[PDB]
Design a binder for this molecule. Structure first.
Ligand SMILES: Nc1nc2c(ncn2[C@@H]2O[C@H](COP(=O)(O)OP(=O)(O)OP(=O)(O)O)[C@@H](O)[C@H]2O)c(=O)[nH]1
Ligand SMILES: Nc1nc2c(ncn2[C@@H]2O[C@H](COP(=O)(O)OP(=O)(O)O)[C@@H](O)[C@H]2O)c(=O)[nH]1
Ligand SMILES: Nc1nc2c(ncn2[C@@H]2O[C@H](COP(=O)(O)OP(=O)(O)O)[C@@H](O)[C@H]2O)c(=O)[nH]1
Ligand SMILES: [Mg+2]
Lengths: 24, 58, 39, 104, 429, 45, 50, 432, 25, 429
């Protein structure tokens, strides 16, 4: 067991490139 | 009707805008030996075609 | 009738494969107009 | 028959007793000549052949980072460099004689 | 009249193989070669992509390209490897080693003689060659290197013929190559002055289709290759099938390329709905034109809000009327003028083909010469400069004979390209 | 070694017999081609 | 003329299949001959051992 | 075609090769006799003869007859060619000079001879796989000589050196630092990619993950064979991202000197705890970068990662690979050097690793083997260099090497070149 | 109207058999 | 229009053996000498190669020349060995010893008298002799020297008959005689002024044909000689059978030899197809011309891309129309203007025979007087001078009676020939 250097656990949703050209 | 193959002309200026008398053709040319890293392509040194605004028809 | 292609057994054939300019699937002449080919 | 005329471009045949109970003769290696196709002939091939381009010598454009020395360690004197009698011989020359396609 | 296809590298060969599967779909060609098409509309223009044989069968007019025989192996042993002509398979004894230098100057140069042989026969054996198509990836060694060598080597011999590249552009997030910037730059500067159309396909968008559009449980390279294959089929459907407003690759190039160096395009496919959400979507012309300009259906990962659309091409397939497609396509521009180039009236050209893809109501292929491409070119240029700054993997390229200022010239070409993109983006009337 | 030789020889004999049977089986199951024609045969009586 | 070239193509296809069959047979003949050479080898090995 | 020649040198190389070849026979369905019970995928490792027999493209070398006689009397006696299985007369006695100058020099020619027989038998060679240990005498000296002779014989052909460096505090011989530092010359100049397989990391991995209180060299060699099989399955079988030996060495080697690369495997779990885990792609990728989940005793967080090449096998999918890689990028406890933002290479094969019956590995749908060039690799090199400094500070054990045929300038040059490598790791890890 | 009823029938048939294949997966 | 044949050396003996097997098959002549053909077309002009006997036997008009009885025994024991006339077999006790001097001066002379006697008998048995055909190898002892002696004698005795020769040109890779340069140099400067037309075969190119195109695994010398035998049949098909545009050896000579010293032709056959490529193939005039002008198809190891075509002849066989054979023959002329000499228009002359070889729809034999044969001449001449400087193996030739001036003038004439080819290759209008 190596030394545990603290690491921020970053769990965020990975929704990306959400764009929509305006139609109608 | 002779020599129209490969060109956009049902009936045969020589034949058409496309080259019906090109020299290289099927046989090819010893180009694998000539390609070498010493000589290469520079800025805007690609072959001049009709798409690049070059009037090759003339 | 079961079509020749197994993929097109679940598809509409006559309405889908018909040009808007133009129903028998066979066009009039093959060797003269479009299917003209060697052999 | 002197070594420094006989081995101008090939490694000396280092004699070694093991494998024999009598005088050692030699052992061939896999080294290939640079591509020297006869001029003008078509690329004629009877069967699958080992391409010389895949076996280009490592001393092709090896950098001479150290004061004019392409070789890095003393191990060139037992790998690349051989003392052919009264002359000294090195295969770093072959890197210059061959091309990037292993062509002479 | 005919398009001759070439696949280069592992990516190019796999994509081309499944693309030929797709082509055989609507041309009714068995894996063996025999034609059992249900209608003769599949045989009307089968000569565009196929060359007939004596046994009533048809051969793809495709040449394969890889220093690695493994991809040829997989393609030929696959379901449709029966179809390809054996002598068109051209391969070497050792792989490219993921090096543009090896694929373009040392390993590819000694191999491209046979490639020129085969492609010249395939090119001049047809009645009137419409153009050349190439499929490869710019991050690879033999797909990018030997592919660009083929492109530049064929451009001079066929200057008047249209020649296009379905370049699978790479990205750091899906970076499976660390020589990615080097290979991408060395391929793209050649493609800039050697290709009439260089359409770009991006892996991040390919996979974001598989989640955010398809919700596939186990998406694979088969699915990605079929996406690229559907793009390839759509871009040339009009040549092979009749339509109300026909178009060809020359017309697409004319309508999409305002300036000679402006020949890189966005890509998109529609309809694409997740198998569980295809119930609720009313598939119509409005829905397709929405999905064209929906983020979920673009084939390359870039942000179009930051950029402007020079030109676009909408290739529709299916039974439709022009009355609603043209009015919809002007409608989008009317309220998206903030995202379209002003000094060009009617930036988007539409084409209508009657035959739809098998199993589809109606499809549409979207090809966009958007100016957001400079963002991703800048992204690849930054990593290229960082790598070139420290001999980062530079010795592999320099040991194959490439001179050091090759990279400087390539980066200057890319800088000029992005500068032109930016200045035509912010140019006003 | 003798048994190996006899077994091998008998096996090649069997294989040659199968090849001979395949050769003796015929491969003309259609109309015989009329290769001996002149273009002058287009003129008819 | 169509049935004429069709009949010749029947002949050509059938002779191609004939040559395919004889090529399979001669290839498996080659494989068997190699196998019998190996059997001679793998009998002479124990001959020399004995 | 599309083959790779396996060379095993020394004790460690020979047992590693035995494990590797039993694993390959298990993969491709060849019985120990050498026969079968599109299956020609074995062609990359076994040459097929007209009789139907499949002779491995392997070459065993050891200066001591015992190990090769063990191989010749084991279960796979009929598998291996009687030649290409060379036996030495007397061992190198843990002496690099003995293996490189006065005894290995007179059988290196037979080594190249049988290697050339393999080369002419093969047609689509991609490279050599040299399995050995630099701690010992034969594997250091004769291995260095063989590699440097192959360098001039076959030119720029790939030579992947799978080498068992001495471990930090687990040691076998007192002259291990000497042999390692001396063989580092050839492993640095005449080897494109060198892979660390030190015994300490494998021991801790077996103790903590395989739940085996008493594993041995047998299990260590099983693990090494699993690693090599995972690495070369891309060319062995069909896969999503087919990658070749040169294809990944060009991406793992940024500089000619900077080519030593650490290795890791996942998931390496015993059958008792293997069914208790979601052995997903993200989980195995995270377990790869675990400091105790690798096969090299060096903490990767003590240096800048430069290039990681991942070999995924089984039902693994490219988007689970990519999600795992994105999570790795987000997890900046492991950081990449500034001039290599990409830093990743991916190779996906569709063939899951077939476990060795009677082994300790468990059957898993998917597996991943990662090989990384990183500046944290300097720890083990600096430790070996300090051991060399302590030993050479007053000429301990140098008389053996000198009286067996090597100069003291060679020792000094070895230490100086290793110091140069120390400086180079830190130079290339420095920020731009 | 009847024609596009049949069209939707074809679409739904393909889609639901594909769903059945996915559940078989 | 009789063509009396002669085969010299073991090479010529095997080539003539397979040639006679092919001719007998094509004319329906079984080995015992009877005739059981299915039509009188092959009986009408059977006198060109077969002489009738009282008992209905059809003996070949062939003369067999070899100083070693072993090859004679082999050909006699061959499948068609009983067809040849028994007394036409002429052989000596002592072999040629692989020596041009031995086969041309000391041993050939003592038996060339009987050879001339039998050749005179065969020639005078004819009604209107078109000429003589010889088959030999220029690297052997009795194939080269004795064949050249025969050619000189028949030149002196029948000046107006057409003298056709099939010379097997040696090459360094195949080279299986250390004195190939000597034999070839000594035979070329006889073939130049004694042979009406001399066409060459290289084992390199035969191996190329059955590797790249036929992909044969273990093709023996019978399969190797089948190609040259087929071309020997195809060059005289126009004499043996009627057709749309007939031709003969006199017409071919006058139509392909513009200058009397330029009569060396590269030769090839089409179609040739591997087992795997038979499906992906076709019997059409387009494919015939494609494979005919394919560089790899020539049975001489010279690359046409480095030279230019003086003239060439296409001996098409089979039911084909004049449009497909004229359109495409002018098409290749137009598209290869860099490789076809300008100062002689219409470099290619086409003849059509209406009886194709059995087993094939349509074939064509190519006879091309390309100016690239100077490369072969220059290569073997360079080998000759390299061997000549050190007087290597010259002690044999000098002890058999020859003098050094003969070798000197031989290489002088050969260098003259290569210079003549190069000058007219680079000459302009
Ligand atoms: N992983 C592994 N390493 C081994 C094995 N056997 C020996 N070694 C390594 O070999 C080192 C000791 O060197 P040696 O005993 O001399 O073995 P060698 O390196 O082959 O050298 P020679 O005995 O002269 O052939 C130890 O530190 C081990 O790391 C093995 O079976 N597996
Ligand atoms: N869409 C798609 N992309 C692929 C496929 N295989 C590889 N790629 C892409 O191609 C790039 C690597 O190309 P590579 O195989 O190394 O090319 P090569 O080295 O020239 O053969 C990566 O960025 C991959 O994303 C595939 O099957 N489909
Ligand atoms: N194509 C072909 N070439 C042959 C044959 N037999 C011999 N040769 C060639 O003839 C050359 C040697 O001729 P040689 O036997 O010395 O002639 P000879 O001494 O007059 O009988 C070699 O280069 C062979 O390639 C054959 O059956 N077919
Ligand atoms: Mg030992």
């Amino acid at each position: 067991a190596a030394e545990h250097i603290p690491d921020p656990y970053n769990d965020k949703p990975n929704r990306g490139r959400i764009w929509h050209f305006r139609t109608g | 009707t002779f020599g129209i193959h490969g060109t956009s002309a049902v009936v045969a200026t020589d034949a058409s805008v496309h080259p019906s008398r090109k020299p290289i053709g099927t046989f090819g040319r010893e180009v694998g030996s000539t390609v070498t890293p010493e000589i290469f392509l520079r800025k805007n040194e690609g072959p001049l075609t009709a798409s690049r605004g070059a009037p090759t028809v003339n | 009738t079961a079509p020749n292609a197994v993929d097109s057994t679940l598809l509409r054939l006559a309405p889908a494969y018909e040009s808007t300019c133009h129903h028998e699937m066979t066009l009039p002449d093959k060797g003269v107009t479009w299917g003209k080919s060697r052999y | 028959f002197a070594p420094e005329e006989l081995y101008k471009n090939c490694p000396p045949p280092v004699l070694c007793q093991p494998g024999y109970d009598f005088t050692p003769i030699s052992y061939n290696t896999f080294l290939l000549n640079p591509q020297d196709p006869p001029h003008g002939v078509r690329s004629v091939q009877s069967n699958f052949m080992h391409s010389k381009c895949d076996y280009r010598p490592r001393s092709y454009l090896r950098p001479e980072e150290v004061t004019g020395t392409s070789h890095a360690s003393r191990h060139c004197h037992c790998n690349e460099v051989f003392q052919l009698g009264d002359h000294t011989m090195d295969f770093a020359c072959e890197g210059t004689m061959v091309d990037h396609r292993n062509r002479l | 009249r005919e398009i001759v296809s070439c696949q280069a590298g592992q990516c190019g060969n796999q994509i081309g193989s499944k693309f030929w599967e797709v082509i055989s779909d609507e041309h009714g060609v068995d894996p063996t070669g025999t034609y059992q098409g249900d209608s003769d509309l599949q045989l009307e223009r089968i000569n565009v992509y196929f060359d007939e044989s004596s046994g009533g069968r048809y051969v793809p007019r495709a040449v394969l390209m890889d220093l690695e025989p493994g991809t040829m192996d997989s393609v030929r042993a696959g379901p449709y490897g029966q179809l390809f002509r054996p002598d068109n398979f051209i391969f070497g004894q050792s792989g490219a080693g993921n090096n543009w230098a090896k694929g373009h100057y040392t390993e590819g140069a000694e191999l491209i003689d046979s490639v020129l042989d085969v492609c010249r026969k395939e090119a001049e054996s047809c009645d009137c060659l419409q153009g050349f198509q190439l499929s490869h990836s710019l991050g690879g060694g033999t797909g990018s290197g030997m592919g660009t060598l083929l492109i530049s080597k064929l451009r001079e011999e066929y200057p008047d013929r249209i020649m296009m590249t379905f370049s699978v552009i790479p990205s750091p997030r899906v970076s499976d190559t660390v020589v990615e910037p080097y290979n991408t730059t060395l391929s793209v500067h050649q493609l800039v002055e050697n290709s009439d159309e260089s359409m770009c396909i991006d892996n991040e968008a390919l996979y974001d289709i598989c989640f955010r559009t398809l919700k596939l449980t186990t998406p694979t390279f088969g699915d990605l290759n079929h996406l690229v294959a559907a793009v390839m089929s759509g871009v040339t459907c009009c040549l092979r099938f009749p339509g109300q407003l026909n178009s060809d690759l020359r017309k697409l190039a004319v309508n999409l390329v305002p300036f000679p160096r402006l020949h890189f395009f966005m890509m998109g496919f529609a309809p694409l709905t997740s198998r569980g959400s295809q119930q609720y979507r009313g598939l119509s012309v409005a829905e397709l034109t929405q999905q064209m300009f929906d983020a979920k259906n673009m084939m390359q990962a870039a942000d179009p809000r930051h950029g402007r659309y020079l030109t676009a091409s909408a290739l529709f397939r299916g039974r439709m009327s022009t009355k609603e497609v043209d009015e919809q396509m002007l409608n989008v521009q009317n309220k998206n003028s903030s995202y379209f180039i002003e000094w060009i009236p009617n930036n988007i050209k539409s084409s209508i083909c009657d035959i739809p893809p098998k199993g589809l109501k109606m499809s549409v292929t979207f090809i966009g010469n958007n100016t957001c491409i400079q963002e991703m070119f800048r992204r690849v240029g930054e990593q290229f400069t960082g790598m070139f700054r420290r001999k980062a993997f530079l010795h592999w390229y320099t040991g194959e004979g490439m001179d050091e200022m090759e990279f400087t010239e390539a980066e200057s070409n890319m800088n000029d390209l992005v500068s032109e993109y930016q200045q035509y983006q912010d140019a006003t009337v | 070694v003798l048994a190996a030789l006899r077994d091998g020889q008998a096996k090649e004999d069997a294989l040659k017999g199968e090849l001979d049977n395949l050769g003796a089986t015929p491969y003309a199951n259609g109309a015989a081609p009329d290769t001996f024609r002149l273009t002058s045969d287009d003129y008819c009586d | 003329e169509q049935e004429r070239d069709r009949a010749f193509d029947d002949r050509n296809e059938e002779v191609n299949y004939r040559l395919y069959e004889v090529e399979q047979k001669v290839a498996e003949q080659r494989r068997l001959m190699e196998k019998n050479g190996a059997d001679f080898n793998r009998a002479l090995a124990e001959q020399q051992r004995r | 075609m599309r083959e790779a020649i396996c060379i095993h040198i020394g004790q460690a190389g020979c047992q590693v090769g035995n494990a590797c070849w039993e694993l390959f026979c298990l993969e491709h369905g060849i019985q120990p006799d050498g026969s079968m019970p599109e299956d020609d995928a074995f062609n990359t490792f076994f040459s097929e003869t007209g009789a139907g027999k499949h002779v491995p493209r392997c070459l065993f070398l050891d200066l001591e007859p015992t190990v090769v006689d063990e191989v010749r009397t084991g279960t796979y006696r009929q598998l291996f060619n009687p030649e290409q299985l060379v036996s030495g007369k007397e061992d190198a006695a843990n002496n690099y000079a003995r293996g490189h100058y006065t005894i290995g020099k007179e059988i290196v020619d037979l080594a190249l001879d049988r290697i050339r027989k393999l080369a002419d038998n093969c047609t689509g060679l991609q490279g050599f796989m040299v399995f050995h240990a630099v701690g010992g005498g034969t594997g250091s000296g004769l291995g260095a000589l063989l590699l440097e002779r192959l360098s001039v014989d076959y030119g720029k052909k790939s030579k992947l050196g799978y080498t068992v460096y001495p471990s930090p505090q687990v040691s076998t011989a007192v002259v291990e630092p000497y042999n390692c530092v001396l063989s580092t010359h050839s492993l640095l100049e005449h080897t494109d990619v060198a892979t660390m397989l030190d015994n300490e990391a494998i021991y801790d991995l077996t103790r903590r993950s395989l739940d085996i209180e008493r594993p041995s060299y047998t299990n260590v060699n099983r693990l090494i064979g699993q690693v090599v099989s995972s690495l070369t399955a891309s060319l062995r079988f069909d896969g999503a991202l087919n990658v070749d030996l040169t294809e990944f060495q060009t991406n793992l080697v940024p500089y000619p000197r900077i080519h030593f690369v650490l290795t890791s495997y996942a998931p390496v779990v015993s059958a008792e705890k293997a069914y208790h885990e979601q052995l997903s792609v993200a989980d195995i990728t995270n377990s790869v970068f675990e400091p105790a989940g690798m096969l090299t005793k060096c903490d990767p967080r003590h240096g800048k990662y430069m290039s990681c090449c991942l070999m995924y096998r089984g039902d693994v999918v490219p988007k689970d690979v990519n999600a795992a890689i994105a999570t790795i990028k987000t997890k900046r406890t492991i950081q990449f050097v500034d001039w290599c933002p990409t830093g990743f290479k991916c190779g996906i094969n569709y063939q899951p690793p077939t476990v060795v019956p009677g082994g300790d590995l468990a059957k898993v749908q998917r597996a991943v083997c990662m090989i990384a060039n990183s500046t944290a690799i300097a720890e083990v090199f600096a430790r070996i260099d300090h051991k060399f400094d302590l030993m050479y500070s007053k000429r301990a054990f140098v008389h053996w090497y000198v009286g067996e045929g090597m100069e003291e300038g060679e020792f000094s040059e070895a230490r100086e070149d290793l110091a140069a490598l120390e400086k180079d790791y830190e130079e290339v890890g420095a920020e731009s | 109207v009847e024609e596009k009823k049949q069209w939707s029938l074809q679409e739904n048939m393909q889609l639901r058999m594909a769903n059945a294949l996915d559940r078989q997966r």
